[PDB]
Amino acid sequence: YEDGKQYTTLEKPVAGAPQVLEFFSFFCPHCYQFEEVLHISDNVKKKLPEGVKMTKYHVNFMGGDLGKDLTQAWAVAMALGVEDKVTVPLFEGVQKTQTIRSASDIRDVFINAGIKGEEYDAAWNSFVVKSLVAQQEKAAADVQLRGVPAMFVNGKYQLNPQGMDTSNMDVFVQQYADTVKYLSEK
């Protein structure tokens, strides 16, 4: 694992940043395969060292105001701690079936998952959610993020995908998780 090949280093690291921060967008195609198809996130967590947890933030430069809403809906997910319950249906409802067309549609997804409407609305307007929306926006700009998907380790190292083996699809996935596993151990 060398700098400039499998990963890179930021000329300005981010203090207080999560151990493993991922950036995605329910609108991005790459992001769809990054998880729904390839399942890169899960593979990473399978090789993640003890005590090390991952964090995923939704970006808002895609999909217009609806994206600005998905980012807030993503904050509700983290607030109530139901990330693993809404991720899949949101990815499908937006890109696959194409049912999710507004905040009203998103609300229905959370309800169908198990969250109550009043519980959703209360959270939707809570300060914890507000802190998260700004926290996510703050984090994105902090790493001078240009596009998604993208993963960062210890707020200093950025994952470099195309700088890794991409012949066999089943290998690229493992190599990525390993680089993360290696950078987390630093």
Curated annotation (Swiss-Prot):
GO terms for biological process: cellular response to antibiotic. This is Thiol:disulfide interchange protein DsbA. CDD domains: DsbA_DsbA (cd03019). Disruption phenotype: Induction of the PhoP/PhoQ two-component regulatory system, suppressed by 50 uM CuSO(4). Disulfide bonds join C28-C31. It comes from Escherichia coli (strain K12). Keywords: Disulfide bond, Periplasm, Redox-active center, Signal. Required for disulfide bond formation in some periplasmic proteins such as PhoA or OmpA. Acts by transferring its disulfide bond to other proteins and is reduced in the process. DsbA is reoxidized by DsbB. Required for pilus biogenesis. PhoP-regulated transcription is redox-sensitive, being activated when the periplasm becomes more reducing (deletion of dsbA/dsbB, treatment with dithiothreitol). MgrB acts between DsbA/DsbB and PhoP/PhoQ in this pathway. InterPro entries: DSBA-like_thioredoxin_dom, DsbA/DsbL, Thiol_disulfide_DsbA, Thioredoxin-like_sf, Thioredoxin_CS, Thioredoxin_domain. It is found in: Periplasm.
